[PDB]
Amino acid sequence: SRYSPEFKDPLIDKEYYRKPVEELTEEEKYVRELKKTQLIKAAPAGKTSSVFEDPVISKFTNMMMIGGNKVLARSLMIQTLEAVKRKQFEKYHAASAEEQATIERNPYTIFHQALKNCEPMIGLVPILKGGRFYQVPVPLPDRRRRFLAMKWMITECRDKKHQRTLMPEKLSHKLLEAFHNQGPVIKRKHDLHKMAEANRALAHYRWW
Amino acid sequence: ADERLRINSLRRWRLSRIVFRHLADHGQLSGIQRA
Amino acid sequence: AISRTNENDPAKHGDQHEGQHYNISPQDLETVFPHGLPPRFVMQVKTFSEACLMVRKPALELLHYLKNTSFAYPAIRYLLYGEKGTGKTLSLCHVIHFCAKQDWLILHIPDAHLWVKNCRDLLQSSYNKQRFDQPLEASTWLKNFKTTNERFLNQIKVQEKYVWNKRESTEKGSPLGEVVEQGITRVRNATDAVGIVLKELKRQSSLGMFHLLVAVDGINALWGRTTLKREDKSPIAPEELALVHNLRKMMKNDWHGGAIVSALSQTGSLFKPRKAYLPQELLGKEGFDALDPFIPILVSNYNPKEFESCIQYYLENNWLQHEKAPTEEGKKELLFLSNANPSLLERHCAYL
Amino acid sequence: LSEYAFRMSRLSARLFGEVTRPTNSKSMKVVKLFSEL
Amino acid sequence: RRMPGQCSVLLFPGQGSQVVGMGRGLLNYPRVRELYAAARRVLGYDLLELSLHGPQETLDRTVHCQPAIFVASLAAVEKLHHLQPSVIENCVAAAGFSVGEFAALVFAGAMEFAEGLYAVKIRAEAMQEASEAVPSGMLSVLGQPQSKFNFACLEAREHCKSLGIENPVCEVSNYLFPDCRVISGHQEALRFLQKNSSKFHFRRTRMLPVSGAFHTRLMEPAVEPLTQALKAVDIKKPLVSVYSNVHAHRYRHPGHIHKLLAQQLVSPVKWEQTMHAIYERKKGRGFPQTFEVGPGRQLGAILKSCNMQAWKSYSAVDVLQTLEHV
Amino acid sequence: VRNPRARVVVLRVKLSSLNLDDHAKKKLIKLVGERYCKTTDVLTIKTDRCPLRRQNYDYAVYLLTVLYHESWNTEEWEKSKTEADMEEYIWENSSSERNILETLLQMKAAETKEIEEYKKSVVSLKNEEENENSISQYKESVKRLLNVT
Ligand SMILES: Nc1ncnc2c1ncn2[C@@H]1O[C@H](COP(=O)(O)OP(=O)(O)OP(=O)(O)O)[C@@H](O)[C@H]1O
Ligand SMILES: Nc1nc2c(ncn2[C@@H]2O[C@H](COP(=O)(O)OP(=O)(O)O)[C@@H](O)[C@H]2O)c(=O)[nH]1
Ligand SMILES: [Mg+2]
Known part of the structure; x- marks a missing residue:
């Protein structure tokens, strides 16, 4: 690393600095006074104080890049968002009066709910002894299941069975399927939840 | 020699790697340092 | 609805309508614009179920010029120019919609760049063995020309015997529609059918039978270079194409009874840098000499009133779905990120 | 390439002593051979 | 020693590339008409009409498709020579699929049109008889x-x-x-x-x-006739590197083409190995131009599957239509 | 003591210090090519052909002499200087003049300082850099000449 150990990661949150000094508790006030003596790393290219910033979509875009091509990955992400938006507008226009109240048209809400519907709660962690890597059920951390939802969505969309259908079109279709609790990613979550129910012998090993 | 060039027309220190290393290590080649 | 104007008749727009969106009816969309609108404006029309164009100073100025045009003097060339995605094509569309309502005969070329690149079936013209034909490019245009001007194709009657083949000829006095029909049925005669149409439209307009509007978007293609090749991998010049050679005759001001309106475009150009937008840079010496004298009209980024009106139109259509877009901070960030550029603003709002 | 530029260049070649006759590039290797030692 | 990219490789198609309309776009080009006249003189029937306009059932027969492909490939070579003389001048390799070898050898100055066409004919009737067996x-x-x-x-x-x-x-x-x-x-x-x-x-x-199972031992009866047709023929040394199909390497000496051309009849076609031998090279080196002289574009698709970078510089000679009336 | 790089000689002379007329200067610049730098108005002739340095100095002086003399000389052949090969843009006998004359004759049939401003605008757009100021001057001139308001 080119940064010395004393350098600290920056805090890009903008409303954080606008809190009145009155609200600040003694601990938060001490933290703020401490921050003045430290060196702060340069903010990396990426996150910004923008109001449209979305860390989940940023992480999904980073997980889609191939070979450092961020422009293409962001282009694909925005194309997918626009495709979801246009599909929802088409479905809203053609719907009758009482079905227009239950049709979501915000693509960010759909993306977040689709990824949430695919998160697994429990997974299997192998453990080594005797030459047998013992598969014990484990409650997945939040970060782990968040990563797994995104990875399953991307791997599902990268399948070679989908011939010449462009990535934004596949991804919007999969996202709208997962929004309604349907599709192969939801089944991949279910086939892990049942296959971890099939191995509840070693369900109490709490020291993975 | 010159005839060969004509008919064709008609158509750093010069030492071994070892001996160089010894002198360069002993400081006998002027200007050659180690990185 | 501060971003809308009830005035849906382009013949009565003025400086008080600047920045306001007027509506084009579906009948006018399918008749006047089978092919005119930009590809990304058509998706907006499909998504919003309505075509609404903002009234801007370039279009207002060009409409003022066309209302006070003398039809006895030779046709005046108007050239719209500006930086990328500033809305010159849609200004041209505003003017075309104005002219179509007053029973002008509209000769609209949606993109002259498509005729100088990526042609798979290029032929040798029988009329002139030194020129090349583009049957798919010509027949595709003829269908939409017929769609726009279906009313006049029977009134307008040819003035010469045109011989398609030893078996087939168009007799003197037959309606122009037959010529158009001959281009649509047999594509072999599509390119020769375009030229005849132009030859007639230039001539009869001079007699005073009708007023003619020649609306050519991406006009800098005509006097540039091509990416079309012979079988021996040699280049083809723009003047060697019959379709391009016949369309240059209509840019010359050797006729009266109409106006010539043109829009430059670097997008889709050949052998031009991304930042070239001025008339001479895009036209070349040959193009500038051909169009000179002409009236250049500048299209620029949105001013604050125009930008606020565009975002209010999008908000009225519920097209900005992010919760912060309605707020002032969202509008300031959109303004910075687009710099009031219509195309960048629309693209950004597409995924918000 | 205009004619004017063409033999204007060919006059410049005569002034600076280059090969006036444009001898493509494969047969100019004689020039490089005899230029050096 | 010239950089590859200004060189050319000519690929000659084989059976299965026949189509009604071969020759149109080649007839008016220089020197093609007397090739088809010689085809009439040697074969005994008018190949020209059959290739130009035929039922396609007459053209699909083994006895008729192969001579059609051979003559069409040579006519396309003439067309390419007319349009781009430098391409024919700067030729490094040649390769034919099944019958295209007989064309390729003729293009390389190893065989003459009459004798080559006779060999192709005899091969065709022999293979038809073997299939009927x-x-x-x-x-x-x-x-x-x-x-x-x-x-x-x-x-x-x-x-x-x-x-x-x-x-x-x-x-x-x-x-x-x-x-x-x-x-x-x-x-x-x-x-x-x-x-x-x-x-x-x-x-x-x-x-x-x-018609039948070609390039297997079932065609053994057809080996002996063809061999006779080749005994009289005096095969010279190819001027360009002509690649074989039996083993997918260049024909070295005239004294082995005689038996390799007969072994091909009952041996598998090593096309993938031939493409590897012609195009394989280190990443970053440029590839020579490739021209498919003959009907169809099948060798183009095969080259795309084999070597995409080589396929980038691939083109086919149009034998169905011509842009300019010469 | 020998060094092969000591034979090189570089002569530098400003063309403004030579007695050249318009045609002579144009010919000299076109002959020399890249040796002439427009920013500095300096002609830089580097000679290294000969073995010695006095010989290269004499050769540089001889080159300068012959370049000057052949710049002051007009061949019969010179007369065919094409328009594209011009350095500036002459408006008389130009396509712009031809087209505007045709347009004015047609307008008079349908029925000057303005022509001076029009030609000024065209000459600016053709020789100098093309900015929106020049484009607007051209627009105003064309509107006034075509009776557009
Ligand atoms: N008058 C207008 N009314 C409504 N939207 C407009 C208008 N002008 C521009 N826009 C918006 O800007 C986008 C770009 O406009 P347009 O395609 O006309 O630009 P252009 O300058 O002709 O582009 P190019 O240089 O690419 O040819 C349109 O799709 C639309 O989103
Ligand atoms: N097949 C056919 N095409 C014609 C005929 N007349 C005109 N055209 C076409 O219509 C176009 C009119 O262009 P024109 O005024 O005649 O200029 P030209 O090319 O010099 O002859 C021509 O370029 C032809 O392509 C005709 O009598 N028969
Ligand atoms: Mg445009």
């Missing part, structure tokens, strides 16, 4: 990574053994490109492959429209 066929199979070809041929053979037949034939006949092959032999074995592709892990299967 026993039912057989050719089956194009595209496999996946888990597909096993020698294995599948084996069960196809025990099938015919169970049915009862002397030495059933089913063996890979044409190496085209990775995981795509052409099997050849008795029709029952090919039916077995078609029906149980599932256990043979074959993604696609397509019966070729051919």
Whole structure:
């Protein structure tokens, strides 16, 4: 690393600095006074104080890049968002009066709910002894299941069975399927939840 | 020699790697340092 | 609805309508614009179920010029120019919609760049063995020309015997529609059918039978270079194409009874840098000499009133779905990120 | 390439002593051979 | 020693590229009409009319397709010479698929039009007779990574053994490109492959429209006639590197073409190895131009599957239509 | 003591210090090519052909002499200088003049300082850099000449 150990990661949150000094508790006030003596790393290219910033979509875009091509990955992400938006507008226009109240048209809400519907709660962690890597059920951390939802969505969309259908079109279709609790990613979550129910012998090993 | 060039027309220190290393290590080649 | 104007008749727009969106009816969309609108404006029309164009100073100025045009003097060339995605094509569309309502005969070329690149079936013209034909490019245009001007194709009657083949000829006095029909049925005669149409439209307009509007978007293609090749991998010049050679005759001001309106475009150009937008840079010496004298009209980024009106139109259509877009901070960030550029603003709002 | 530029260049070649006759590039290797030692 | 990119490789198609309308767009070009006149003189029937306008059933017969392809390939070579003399001048290699070799050799100055056409003819009738002797066929199979070809041929053979037949034939006949092959032999074995592709892990299967199982031992009767047709012919040394199909390497001396051209008749076509031998090189080196002189564009697709970077500089000579009336 | 790089000689002279007329200067610049730098108005002739340095100095002086003399000389052949090969843009006998004359004759049939401003605008747009100021001057001139308001 080119940064010395004393350098600290920056805090890009903008409303954080606008809190009145009155609200600040003694601990938060001490933290703020401490921050003045430290060196702060340069903010990396990426996150910004923008109001449209979305860390989940940023992480999904980073997980889609191939070979450092961020422009293409962001282009694909925005194309997918626009495709979801246009599909929802088409479905809203053609719907009758009482079905227009239950049709979501915000693509960010759909993306977040689709990824949430695919998160697994429990997974299997192998453990080594005797030459047998013992598969014990484990409650997945939040970060782990968040990563797994995104990875399953991307791997599902990268399948070679989908011939010449462009990535934004596949991804919007999969996202709208997962929004309604349907599709192969939801089944991949279910086939892990049942296959971890099939191995509840070693369900109490709490020291993975 | 010159005839060969004509008919064709008609158509750093010069030492071994070892001996160089010894002198360069002993400081006998002027200007050659180690990185 | 501060971003809308009830005035849906382009013949009565003025400086008080600047920045306001007027509506084009579906009948006018399918008749006047089978092919005119930009590809990304058509998706907006499909998504919003309505075509609404903002009234801007370039279009207002060009409409003022066309209302006070003398039809006895030779046709005046108007050239719209500006930086990328500033809305010159849609200004041209505003003017075309104005002219179509007053029973002008509209000769609209949606993109002259498509005729100088990526042609798979290029032929040798029988009329002139030194020129090349583009049957798919010509027949595709003829269908939409017929769609726009279906009313006049029977009134307008040819003035010469045109011989398609030893078996087939168009007799003197037959309606122009037959010529158009001959281009649509047999594509072999599509390119020769375009030229005849132009030859007639230039001539009869001079007699005073009708007023003619020649609306050519991406006009800098005509006097540039091509990416079309012979079988021996040699280049083809723009003047060697019959379709391009016949369309240059209509840019010359050797006729009266109409106006010539043109829009430059670097997008889709050949052998031009991304930042070239001025008339001479895009036209070349040959193009500038051909169009000179002409009236250049500048299209620029949105001013604050125009930008606020565009975002209010999008908000009225519920097209900005992010919760912060309605707020002032969202509008300031959109303004910075687009710099009031219509195309960048629309693209950004597409995924918000 | 205009004619004017063409033999204007060919006059410049005569002034600076280059090969006036444009001898493509494969047969100019004689020039490089005899230029050096 | 010239950088590759200003060099040219001429690829000559083989049987299966016939189409109604070969020759149109080549006739008006220099020197083609007397090639077709000589074709009439040697064959005994008017090849020109049959290739230009035919039922396509007369053209699909083995006796007729091969001479058509040979003459059309040479006429396309003449057209390419007229349009681009430098391409023909700077030629490094040549290769034909099955019958295109007879064209390629003729293009290389190793054989003459009359003798080459006679050899192609005799080959054609001999192969037709061999096909008539026993039912057989050719089956194009595209496999996946888990597909096993020698294995599948084996069960196809025990099938015919169970049915009862002397030495059933089913063996890979044409190496085209990775995981795509052409099997050849008795029709029952090919039916077995078609029906149980599932256990043979074959993604696609397509019966070729051919008379019999070419490039197998079933064509053994046709070897001896063709050999005679070649004894009289005096084969010279090819001017360009002409690549063989029996073993997929350059023809070295005139004294081996005589027997290699007969071994081809009963040996698999090594097209993939030929493409590898012509185009394989380090990443970053430039590839020579490639011209498919003859009907169709099949060799283009095969080259795309084999080597994409080589395919980037590929073009085909149009034998169905011409841009400019010469 | 020998060094092969000591034979090189570089002569530098400003063309403004030579007695050249318009045609002579144009010919000299076109002959020399890249040796002439427009920013500095300096002609830089580097000679290294000969073995010695006095010989290269004499050769540089001889080159300068012959370049000057052949710049002051007009061949018969010179007369065919094409328009594209011009350095500036002459408006008389130009396509712009031809087209505007045709347009004015047609307008008079349908029925000057303005022509001076029009030609000024065209000459600016053709020789100098093309900015929106020049484009607007051209627009105003064309509107006034075509009776557009
Ligand atoms: N008058 C207008 N009314 C409504 N939207 C407009 C208008 N002008 C521009 N826009 C918006 O800007 C986008 C770009 O406009 P347009 O395609 O006309 O630009 P252009 O300058 O002709 O582009 P190019 O240089 O690419 O040819 C349109 O799709 C629309 O989103
Ligand atoms: N097939 C056919 N095409 C014609 C005929 N007349 C005109 N055209 C076409 O219509 C176009 C009119 O262009 P024109 O005024 O005649 O200029 P030209 O090319 O010099 O002859 C021509 O370029 C032809 O392509 C005709 O009598 N028969
Ligand atoms: Mg445009």
